[PDB]
């Protein structure tokens, strides 16, 4: 299977079928998003708009998930029942959260087949995030009154952010229901997001898993780890760009400030996760709306128990949103420990050396002695290489599930990431 023999058929037999399949599977979702956007411009009553997006969400859920969408429908009905029963309370967040938790647990306890649950994990995660965020917004006082049935439904079934789309606050969805003019900035954002989504899709499917033997003349257990990591990262970037494309096509995802309308919904940042500065930056820039949801709700609610327990329960809730499945809770707990130890070691070195080696670039007001130079840049490059190593190790699980499979993968990778994290923690203990 010579390199030239691979490339002679690469273009056609990989770039055309995968792009064509992406288009054939997302064209109807894009059409329905555009139809809802155009229909929310005629100036119908608000409840008509919410009913329209409810019907659009029903049709989209049916198209993607053939008939197993009854689980998402029952999750929405149950979330509304729990929000209505506790509409006058101040605990709405914890009530909706316990309801969501019990639902996901009873689901994973063989309420539905493993394949269909793996298929609908994303839709149910978005519905759960939306319901819990609305509960906590009503609790804290950032949303005035509880929504009517049709408003709550049209929020959960927003045709833009139902299948792929990110979590958007209830007020973002309300502003979307208001609608904004179909300017040239809007179409520019939608077209650019679709182009980047298709580019990242074809990269993840064609160039990712086949770059180290062919695209680079270099070549192994770590080269394949980096290949799989990059393939999964670019698949997720495709999903993110497509999600923001649909959320901007439906109308949502804008920030109107000072009567200046910028369609600036960003879901992922590929240049911050591929060329990282620190694992905290990777976790932040991987999924930006999901990071905002997690940080804000879970972390601000549980910070009272100390920062370490707060981030631990943050990652626990992150693994629970997905539904308890191995290779997705082990990875997330390893991420918790890695980011914690890395940020702590960065703070300790930036204290003992007063240098600019923090986990995030220092603001201009910091009294650090080494703002620039060679030591700071070399140490930042070292920590970036460690972050790339951790990312490749963790993403090796996505070679192109079973606990035995994960232990096998990490054992054939010799557990080097956990050893490195433990060594960094011991080093922090010895320094401080």
């Amino acid at each position, epitope marked *: 299977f010579s390199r030239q023999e691979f490339f002679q058929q690469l273009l056609q037999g990989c770039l055309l079928p995968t792009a064509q399949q992406g288009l054939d599977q997302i064209w109807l979702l894009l059409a329905i998003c555009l139809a809802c956007r155009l229909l929310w411009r005629l100036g119908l009553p608000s409840y008509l708009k919410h009913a329209s997006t409810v019907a659009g969400g029903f049709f989209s859920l049916y198209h993607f998930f053939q008939l197993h969408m009854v689980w998402v429908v029952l999750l929405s009905l149950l979330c509304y029942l729990v929000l209505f029963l506790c*509409r*006058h309370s*101040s605990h709405r967040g914890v009530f909706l959260s316990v309801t969501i938790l019990i639902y996901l647990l009873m689901g994973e306890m063989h309420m539905v087949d493993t394949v269909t649950w793996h298929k609908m994990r994303g839709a149910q995660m978005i519905v759960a995030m939306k319901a819990v965020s609305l509960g906590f917004d*009503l*609790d804290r*006082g950032e*949303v*005035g009154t509880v929504p009517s049935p049709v408003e709550f439904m049209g929020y959960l079934y927003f045709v833009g952010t139902i299948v792929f789309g990110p979590w958007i606050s209830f007020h973002s969805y309300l502003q979307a229901v*208001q609608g904004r003019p179909l300017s040239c900035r809007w179409l520019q954002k939608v077209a650019r997001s679709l182009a980047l989504a298709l580019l990242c899709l074809v990269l993840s499917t064609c160039v990712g898993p086949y770059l180290f033997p062919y695209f680079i003349p270099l070549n192994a257990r770590w080269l394949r780890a980096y290949e799989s990591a990059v393939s999964f990262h670019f698949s997720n970037y495709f999903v993110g760009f497509l999600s923001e494309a649909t959320a901007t096509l439906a109308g949502a995802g804008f920030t109107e400030e000072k009567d200046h309308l910028e369609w600036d919904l960003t879901v992922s940042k590929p240049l911050n996760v591929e060329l990282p500065r620190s694992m905290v930056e990777v976790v932040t820039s991987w999924n930006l709306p999901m990071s905002y949801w997690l940080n804000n709700y879970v972390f601000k609610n549980a910070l009272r128990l100390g920062t370490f327990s707060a981030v631990l329960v943050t990652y626990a809730a992150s693994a629970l949103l997905h539904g308890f499945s191995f290779h997705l809770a082990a990875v997330l707990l390893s991420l918790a420990f890695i980011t914690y130890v890395e940020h702590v070691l960065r703070k300790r070195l930036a204290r003992i050396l007063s240098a600019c080696v923090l986990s995030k670039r220092c603001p201009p007001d910091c009294s650090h002695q080494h703002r620039l130079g060679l030591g700071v840049r070399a140490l930042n490059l070292l920590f970036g290489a460690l972050a790339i190593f951790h990312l490749a190790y963790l993403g090796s699980l996505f070679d192109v599930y079973g606990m035995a499979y994960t232990v096998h993968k990490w054992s054939e990778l010799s557990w080097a990431s956990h050893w490195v994290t433990f060594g960094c923690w011991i080093f922090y203990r010895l320094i401080g």
Partner: antibody
Amino acid sequence: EIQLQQSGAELVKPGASVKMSCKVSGYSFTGYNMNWVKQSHGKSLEWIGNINPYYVSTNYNQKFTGKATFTVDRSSSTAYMQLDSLTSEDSAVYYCARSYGSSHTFAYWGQGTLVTVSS
Amino acid sequence: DIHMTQSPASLSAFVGETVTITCRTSENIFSYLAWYQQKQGKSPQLLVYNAKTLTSGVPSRFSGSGSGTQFSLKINSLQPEDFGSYYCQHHYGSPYTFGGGTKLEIK
């Protein structure tokens, strides 16, 4: 028969600090937000913020951040507000207002604590 | 944030007359607008919430209406205990801002 009994009047020198109290009575104190409302002498009402008594998480108006601090004491079921570095413009009446359940309207109000600053 | 322009700033009427107070909003609030009534010296009192829904105890002579950015409160058959100050307040989302106020006086 909900009754949000509030503290007495106050007369402090500028730059000092005051800590009002709104002793609640009539319902489960930790089940409804406690909106704090400021009204000048014959002017419009202004919303300072609200403290959620279940988990103590405040939400301040951007104008009154740093100028107001909400603390609650669920043992005696009284909500407090502190004013830091009082200026001559804070001679107003401050109400405590319970949020009307689902909506965030102010169903039950206190009676007001006349705060006046002078020398 | 959201600004609540309320007119008129003052209003005189008789006993049994019909009056209407308007509260125009600088943004869309989806009919989230409450109406209070502060008498001379007392604390305010919620009369109408959700711009249409009366509360428990307020008589039937009050009736809120409107939606979007132009709301109104119509008080028919003014009784002597209907005279005070009326402050419209949106409950769309934090921060909550009240209106200017309408001093309803007898004459």
